[PDB]
C-alpha cells in the first residue's frame, strides 16, 4: 500500500509515491544531491516534511517532467503536500496555514501586436 | 628572446608571446609550438638556447615580415595601376566590397568634416 500525489507549477508535472520507513529519496532514478545541485531547490523539496515531524519516517519515489529547476521543485513540493494530506488527513490546517496547499497559477503572458514584448513598448518621439 | 627581426615579450605564455610576430595568429602559434615540441603553458623566460633555435627554424617556413608587407603592397598597386573598379575605390578612399556610403563609412572616410 502506497500514498499518491500529483503536483503542477508553471509547465511542470510531478508524480509522488510515499511509503513508511527510513527516509530516502529518488528523483528520476537519482538522489536529491545528484539531481538538484541548488541549495534553494533542496530546501524547497524538503520544506513540507520539515514543517511536520516526519523527516525520517517515510520513503519517497518521485518522477517529474517539464519546465526548469524552480518549477520542478515547486511541483514536487505540491505533490508531497497532497500525498501527506491523503495519508494523514489531520495536517491540513498546518499545511494550509503555511500556504503549501494552493496551486500557484501565474503563467507567461503572450506577445501582442505593436509591442516588442508582453508590455514593453517601442520608443516615442513627440516630433 | 629575439626570434624574428624583432624581440618578443619574456613574461607571458609562449602561445600568446609568439603572436607579436606580424603574420602569426592563434592557429600558426599552436602549430609552431606543436612542431617544436614545447608545452604551451611556458613563459619563454624558462626556455633554453636550443629550444629557441628550434623555434626560429620552425618560424622560418612562413612569410612573416618584410616579404609579406611587400606582397600586399604590390597587390594594391597592381590594382591601382590596372585601373579597375577596386583600384579606383582604393585611390579615392571609399569602401570596396559594396557597403553603404549614404551613412557611415567612417573607417574609410575619417572623422566628421575632413
Amino acid at each position: 500500500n502506497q500514498y499518491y500525489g500529483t503536483g503542477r507549477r508553471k509547465s511542470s508535472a510531478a508524480r509522488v509515491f510515499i511509503k513508511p520507513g527510513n527516509g530516502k529519496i529518488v528523483i528520476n532514478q537519482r538522489s536529491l544531491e545528484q539531481y538538484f545541485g541548488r541549495e534553494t531547490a533542496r530546501m524547497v523539496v524538503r520544506q513540507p516534511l520539515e514543517l511536520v515531524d516526519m523527516v525520517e519516517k517515510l520513503d519517497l519515489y518521485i518522477t517529474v517532467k517539464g519546465g526548469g529547476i524552480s518549477g520542478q521543485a515547486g511541483a514536487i513540493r505540491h505533490g508531497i503536500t497532497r500525498a501527506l494530506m491523503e495519508y494523514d488527513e489531520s495536517l491540513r490546517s498546518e499545511l494550509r496555514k503555511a500556504g503549501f496547499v494552493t496551486r500557484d497559477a501565474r503563467q507567461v503572458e503572450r506577445k501582442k501586436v505593436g509591442l516588442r514584448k508582453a508590455r514593453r513598448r517601442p520608443q516615442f518621439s513627440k516630433r | 628572446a629575439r626570434i624574428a627581426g624583432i624581440n618578443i615579450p619574456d613574461h607571458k605564455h609562449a602561445v600568446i608571446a609568439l603572436t607579436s610576430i606580424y603574420g602569426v595568429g592563434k592557429t600558426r602559434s599552436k602549430a609552431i609550438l606543436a612542431a617544436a615540441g614545447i608545452a604551451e603553458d611556458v613563459k619563454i623566460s624558462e626556455l633554453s638556447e636550443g629550444q629557441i633555435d628550434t623555434l626560429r627554424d620552425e618560424v622560418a617556413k612562413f612569410v612573416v615580415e618584410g616579404d609579406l608587407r611587400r606582397e600586399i603592397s604590390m597587390s594594391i598597386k597592381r590594382l591601382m595601376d590596372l585601373g579597375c573598379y577596386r583600384g579606383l575605390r582604393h585611390r579615392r578612399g571609399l569602401p570596396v566590397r559594396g557597403q553603404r556610403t549614404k551613412t557611415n563609412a567612417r573607417t574609410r572616410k575619417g572623422p566628421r568634416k575632413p
Partner: protein
C-alpha cells in the same frame, strides 16, 4: 497611486541562515536575473568578514547596518515659484532599504580585484565607522539640520 492599496509580497528566507534581511540584501545586490552569482558573492564576503572580525556573520552585518542607518531626510516642496527643503522623518523599512542601497553603491565603486573583496572591505570600514556610506549619512543629517526653520 490615487485610489489603490499596496499589499506586502511574501519573501523567502535565505537557505543557510534564515535571514529575511539577507534575502533582501541578495535581491538588492542582484543583477540581470541571476541569483546564484549574488548568493555566492554574499556568502564569500560574509565568511571573510567573520574571519577578519572574530564574530558571527549576523552580528557583523547588523553592526555595519546600525552604523549607516539614517533617521531624518529632506523632501522638496514648491512655494511661491521657489524650492523649499522640508525635513521629514523616516520609517524603519525605509531606513533599512536606504542603508543597504548606499552600502552596495559605495562598494561597487572601489578598485580592488573582486566584488567579494570589495564588499568585505566596505563592510569592515562601515563597522569601523568610516567610509563613503557614513559620509553620505553625515551629509544627509547636515542638510536636514540646516533647514530646521521650515519644519
Amino acid at each position: 497611486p490615487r485610489r489603490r492599496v499596496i499589499g506586502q509580497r511574501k519573501i523567502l528566507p535565505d537557505p543557510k541562515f534564515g535571514s529575511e534581511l539577507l534575502a533582501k540584501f541578495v535581491n538588492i545586490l542582484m543583477v540581470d536575473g541571476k541569483k546564484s552569482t549574488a548568493e555566492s558573492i554574499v556568502y564569500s564576503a560574509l565568511e571573510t568578514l567573520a574571519q577578519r572580525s572574530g564574530k558571527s556573520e549576523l552580528e557583523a552585518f547588523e553592526v555595519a547596518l546600525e552604523n549607516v542607518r539614517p533617521t531624518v531626510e529632506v523632501k522638496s516642496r514648491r512655494v511661491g515659484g521657489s524650492t523649499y527643503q522640508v525635513p521629514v522623518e523616516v520609517r524603519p523599512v525605509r531606513r533599512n532599504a536606504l542603508a543597504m542601497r548606499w552600502i552596495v553603491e559605495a562598494a561597487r565603486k572601489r578598485g580592488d580585484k573582486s566584488m567579494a573583496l570589495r564588499l568585505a572591505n566596505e563592510l569592515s570600514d562601515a563597522a569601523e565607522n568610516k567610509g563613503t556610506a557614513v559620509k553620505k549619512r553625515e551629509d544627509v543629517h547636515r542638510m536636514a539640520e540646516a533647514n530646521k526653520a521650515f519644519a
